[model samples]
Target: MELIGDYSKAFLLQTVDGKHQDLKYISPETMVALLTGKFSNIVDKFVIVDCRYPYEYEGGHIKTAVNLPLERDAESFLLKSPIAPCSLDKRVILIFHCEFSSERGPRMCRFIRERDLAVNDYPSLYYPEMYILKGGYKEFFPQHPNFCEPQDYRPMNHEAFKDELKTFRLKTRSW
Candidate 1:
């Protein structure tokens, strides 16, 4: 069996661009199962990275997810941290996702992979086991509220979040 065990065979997907082959996609159900210890053999440890803004993340997020917003925050929290480079273990995977797993989620996934490749040997990596949540919090929250913290879901375009959206948008003009 592979290090991922049954996870390597179930609910994993390839991205459309195929640019970042090492990066794979995973479904919400799998995340729930993993969190619940259904896949305990392969679920040694992992971190869920929320790529959404601080407002959205605070509104609601998956259990134990860290708010790493965009590249700047993500980079600083991960690559810049001494802990990241030293902890080169495959058992602790880092799963990243934005509100929809569309733009920001996949982009951050790629960014980490590219940065990891730059520092390590071609195949070896600090955090080799990385994944992107396929449908992100939007898709996961509805089906699995028990797995989410605070059990709430807020769309990025919701009327109440407009000001917060603009605030973060201005911060990341390129997004």
Candidate 2:
């Protein structure tokens, strides 16, 4: 029988309009209700991680999320997060979010998944059923204003997303 962990992956690299698309998505409204304990009947619970950098996270994030901008130590944080309880259950879910859903969210998952003991861990490895929140914080905050910080989300007012990309000092990845 097919299980959640055994779910399909034919679309991981599939592209739309020059960008890869996620196979499935979780909505902000749904997540909020789940976090509030107003919704149940799930096989497991959530393990939400804020994939954005520290400054971005400090801007605004969901209620039940923790900032985990990881490269190598991904397993350490996931195992330490609420992910453990849900990791043991097929029904439990994993969720990631960033300023946008396209890159940071899925990209981080790929990085961590490669090191996960469940997938192939060096230590405490976990691979919970995971999904990226659709539309990311962009649309999420608008749909659920109360879920985020009032002074946060300042990026919404700026159009400088890539204005500083060239100025960024690129770090060499040893992978």
Candidate 3:
């Protein structure tokens, strides 16, 4: 039986287009830079889509990324979302990722481009520019600083208790 980690990289690469393609199958060094706020200036321009499940996202994710949950619909969600066929904003770069660098990542890219072409007469609004996060989150996260630490549920704790009074003060004060 194939383990999830054994999934194929080629399958994930197939998801994006050449023009709008921004999927970066980068080295651990690059991934580290991205997560550590070293790449913050460039990050704001693009929309990083976490294609993993909501549960996986809750565990951890690229900071500031929005959860698209691609595995759910897989077929038509990107087409309907503001990031793809529905919009013509090339300035908004879309990054797709899953548990591993294998099937889900690339499949989502391919789904967006191919599905857009199938339904629309012209290329979908955001064609040829989609990018896949090469190697997916699996390859990227290990290099991140907090990858091995126990998940921090402090935010959840604050929310659960309505404990915003002290937290707000801490956030505003620079220590």
Candidate 4:
């Protein structure tokens, strides 16, 4: 259990170039651009895995981002992630984030990396690129409300809604 709880970035990886690929967190600015499809040809292909609790995610989340609470089995969802499938063609960059992008984001990122290594199946099945949002969701929400799509209101948290300062994104065009 203790081993599973650890998220140090010293894990061994077998790379095609025999060099340790840079495994660092992506800045919020980059995520914003990517989320808005302002950067690449692969539109609607990137994955945004939200590692927040269900209620927190329901309250508000990035557009098209899937909620994978910290309590869930991170590996079980890897092969069937919303953004990436169990195939080479569908594989895409994965960006993991949480409310603060400090713990859960990196923890889940390392978890997926270790799982991909353990599978030892198609090497290409491993994510082409992965990152942890530097400032986490907290930094992104205030700066870019248009890109985020918070549920209008979570009935379960109605009482707490009064204290909510962040506005939930109601209009959305694409997933």
Candidate 5:
């Protein structure tokens, strides 16, 4: 998929360079499960990292996600932050997310792996898992109303509401 910004392009190129061989993109269903407490089995087992800016994260984020701004100083943040808080004796999975996986997730995965901070050196550290929300935040946020603070004014029954929105789009298609 074509990404919307320079940071995203860099990530795409790096991912192509074998920096994230073990990373896995999460499906929409999986993302919803993670947010709704339906996937507790692996939720506690892994550390969810958010790669958006600090400001964006302050707006709202996954409850347990640790905000690690990839746009600021990607390399320094990874090496200096307490990302892997535990000692190198316990297994910990690392799960990462950005506004879109195409934007920051892949880049963070690549950075973590390239530094050899992943599971191999630290046996306590398990495999690094990367998940990009399919269709980005646009897809996930709509399904989760609680994540929004004041609540975005949109139809609760989107499937039915979408038809009406579609008609408006069609009407404007000529423009």
Candidate 6:
């Protein structure tokens, strides 16, 4: 017996190029809807990957977010095990972001995809549908404070976390 988690119909984004389909952008409203159980039937589970440094994350983050902090953590914890494509009665979606969804966020997103592509067969992905939160946390927190825990916002370049940021970014280079 084959089990399937076909929640594809539930998360349709307006896509651009159809060539590689590296990743998609998900809006804050849609993210809120997902968290609020609007697609509970379709989406069995989902994760918001916080790719910022721990200090930045400690200051504030999405209520449901997990701090992967380093790119290595995302590779080992997420891609190496646990969150793979399922053939069982479960669907797991991923949403990745940093301060602005610019450098670290997109970089980690593609980094995961590149690794996913290497392991799985061509055209088949470990995670066929993943998302980058459009506008990232900076744009999200102001309008949707209700969805954030502790109700706060912290920029990646914030002075408080400067040292921690250097430490974490340095780790990314070695591996």
Q: Please, what is the whole-model Cα lDDT of each candidate in the order they appear?
A: 0.73, 0.59, 0.49, 0.59, 0.49, 0.74
Residue-level lDDT of model 2, residues 46-138, one tens digit each, is 667777665566678877677776554456776545354433322455677777777777887766665554554343335535667777887
Give per-residue lDDT, candidate 3, residue 165: 36
Tens digits of per-residue lDDT, candidate 5, 16-49, equal 2223444555654565565566645434445567
Q: Is candidate 1 or candidate 5 better by lDDT?
A: 1
Write one digit per residue (lDDT tens) for candidate 6, span 34-53.
88988676567788998878
Q: Which ten residues in a row have the lowest lDDT in candidate 2?
A: 9-18
Which candidate wins on TM-score? Answer: 6
Residue-level lDDT of model 4, residues 99-162, one tens digit each, is 7776667777877877766655544334546767766677777777777776332332356754
Model 5: pairs clashing at backbone N, Cα or C within 3 Å: 90-124, 91-124
lDDT of 6: 0.74
Clashing residue pairs in candidate 6 are: none
> What's the distance in Å from true for residue 131, model 1?
1.3
Which is better, 5 or 6, measured by lDDT? Answer: 6
For model 6, the superposed segments whose C-alpha errors exceed 4 Å read 1-22, 84-90
Candidate 4 stretches with Cα past 4 Å from truth are: 1-22, 42-44, 71-73, 80-91, 121-124, 151-175
TM-score of each: 0.79, 0.67, 0.51, 0.63, 0.51, 0.82
How much is the lDDT of residue 116 in candidate 2?
56
lDDT of 1 by residue, 25-90 (tens): 777877876687775554456778899988888878999999988677787777775233222221
Where model 2 places Cα greater than 4 Å from the true spot, the runs are: 6-22, 38-44, 80-82, 86-90, 117-125, 156-175
Q: Poorest 10 consecutive residues of model 4 by lDDT?
A: 11-20
19 Cα displacement, candidate 1 (Å)? 12
Global CA lDDT computed for model 4: 0.59
Error (Å) of candidate 1 at residue 57 is 1.0
Q: What does candidate 3's lDDT look like per residue over 6-29, in tens digits?
A: 121112222322232434444445
